[PDB]
Write a structure and sequence with these properties.
This is part of a larger assembly, with chains A, B and C. Chain B has two helices and no strands. By secondary structure, chain B is mostly helical. Chain C is rod-shaped and about 95 Å long. Helix content of chain C is 16%, strand content 8%. In chain C, 5% of the residues are buried. The chains are: A alpha+beta, B mainly alpha, C alpha+beta. Chains in contact: A-B, A-C. The structure holds adenosine-5'-diphosphate. Chain C: Belongs to the dynactin subunit 2 family.
Chain lengths: 370, 49, 37
């Protein structure tokens, strides 16, 4: 026995949510809380001091933004409860919580303590009847409806590649990199001070993030493309100010393939990705050549998959046809896939009742992990 | 029912008030309720729950 | 209103506008196939 569950597609930057069997996440709001810088002695103005969404984005000025979650590992768990309480807002739910099944998201390569504390929240502070969350890549595959695939997510500062054969991942061939657009914008901030500009405020930095997402693409041959002169079509701020560009429009996003240039013993998404592919079956790579699942919204770049095709030619196999799946609802793919799963009578076997948590809890977490 | 030894009485099935009122009004109109008789209330998971 | 209030003291923007103003002015295509043969 249950109610209609809700799929909460936790984007590393923007969390999303929405009831079962639907097509579009009901809510789409980010992951940070602002608190006012200035206080007042005046009587009659606003209250709250904790805002997320249009309230925060509305009056960004005093609300000092702080991202509580880092690579899934959140440190403001209490504030996450407040965030989920905000998910239970009047404008948000007006529903109950201890009487409905739900669905959140889970990326791999994580400490169990996160799931442990999560169960503590939803089953100590809440009394959720049944709830089970699994690997996000399968949800993307649900959106595809394709047995095998190479899913690559793209969070704000989180990325990971997973190959799955008919609903079976490869634990010995799954990789992850701790970065996405987060340090890309931070690196753009670096470029800003490289040519003398600081955008040290939190909101200011998110504005920089929006600028990045607004004007950035991929180049063909980076060192050869460096030989030209960027004309820097200046954009003009909401404040009304000159915005130069530099190589940032193409150089800054390729930091992903130059972690040594940023200071990290890593190689590249496609590099370690194809390495894990090499660790897979001699035969399944053939399937994965056409089964290339693109996911995550950080992927929005001109010639993104095209430069990725160039990367494929860099890591060329022994002449075998390859194909990439590049949909348009890559962020929504996981939410919709969960909605598909949430629209299944198979969750009876795929769930864990709260009574099970009452009986064991931690042991149910360890044993009934997946 | 006990005096009649019915062993169990036919307990009232709880039906929604607005649903009954809409069905009554539709019967006054001479036709059973339409598809979107509630309009966009179909997309209200609260009412659905 | 404050009309007799205005009759008492003289600090009223008489015959002058109270507002001044700077006037008006006039996709992700899939199938990236690396056909390698
Ligand atoms: N024009 C754009 N170019 C690149 N990335 C973008 C653009 N617009 C939005 N994004 C990205 O969409 C991504 C959504 O990330 P997130 O919701 O954290 O993904 P995930 O669901 O994989 O965690 C953000 O990382 C943000 O940088």
């Amino acid at each position: 026995i249950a109610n209609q569950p809700v799929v909460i597609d936790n984007g590393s930057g923007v969390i999303k949510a929405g009831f079962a069997g639907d097509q579009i996440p009901k809510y789409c709001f980010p992951n940070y809380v602002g608190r006012p810088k200035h206080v007042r002695v005046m009587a009659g103005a606003l209250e709250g001091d904790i805002f997320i969404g249009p309230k925060a984005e509305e009056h960004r000025g005093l609300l000092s933004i702080r991202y509580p979650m880092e690579h899934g590992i959140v440190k403001d768990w209490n504030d996450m409860e407040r965030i989920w309480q905000y998910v239970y807002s009047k404008d948000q739910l007006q529903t109950f919580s201890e009487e409905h099944p739900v669905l959140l998201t889970e990326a791999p390569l994580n400490p169990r303590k996160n799931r442990e504390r999560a169960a503590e929240v939803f089953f100590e502070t809440f009394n959720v009847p049944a709830l089970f969350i699994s690997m996000q890549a399968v949800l993307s595959l649900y959106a595809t409806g394709r047995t095998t695939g190479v899913v690559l997510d793209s969070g704000d500062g989180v990325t990971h590649a997973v190959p799955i054969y008919e609903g079976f991942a490869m634990p010995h061939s799954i990789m992850r990199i701790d970065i996405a657009g987060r340090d890309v914008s931070r690196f753009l901030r670096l470029y800003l001070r490289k040519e003398g500009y600081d955008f040290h405020s939190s909101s200011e930095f998110e504005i920089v993030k929006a600028i990045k997402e607004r004007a950035c693409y991929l180049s063909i041959n980076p060192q050869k493309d460096e030989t030209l002169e960027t004309e820097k079509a200046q954009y003009y701020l909401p404040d009304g100010s000159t915005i130069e560009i530099g190589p940032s429009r193409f150089r800054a996003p390729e930091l992903l393939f130059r972690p040594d240039l940023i200071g990290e013993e890593s190689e590249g998404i496609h590099e370690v990705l194809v390495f894990a592919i090499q660790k897979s079956d001699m035969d399944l790579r053939r399937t994965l050549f056409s089964n290339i699942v693109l996911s995550g919204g950080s992927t929005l770049f001109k010639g993104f998959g095209d430069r990725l095709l160039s990367e494929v030619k860099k890591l060329a196999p022994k002449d075998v046809k390859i194909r990439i799946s590049a949909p348009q609802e890559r962020l929504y793919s996981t939410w919709i896939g969960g909605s598909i799963l949430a629209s299944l009578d198979t969750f009876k076997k795929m769930w864990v009742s709260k009574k099970e948590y009452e009986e064991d809890g931690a042991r149910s977490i360890h044993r009934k992990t997946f | 029912h006990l005096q009649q030894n019915i062993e169990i009485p036919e307990i009232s099935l709880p039906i929604h008030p607005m649903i009954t009122n809409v069905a009554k009004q539709c019967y006054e109109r001479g036709e059973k309720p339409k598809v979107t008789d509630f309009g966009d209330k179909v997309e209200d998971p609260t009412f659905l729950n | 209103m404050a009309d007799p209030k205005y009759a008492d003291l003289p600090g009223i923007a008489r015959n002058e506008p109270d507002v001044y103003e700077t006037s008006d002015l006039p996709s992700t295509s899939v199938e990236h196939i690396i056909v390698n043969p």
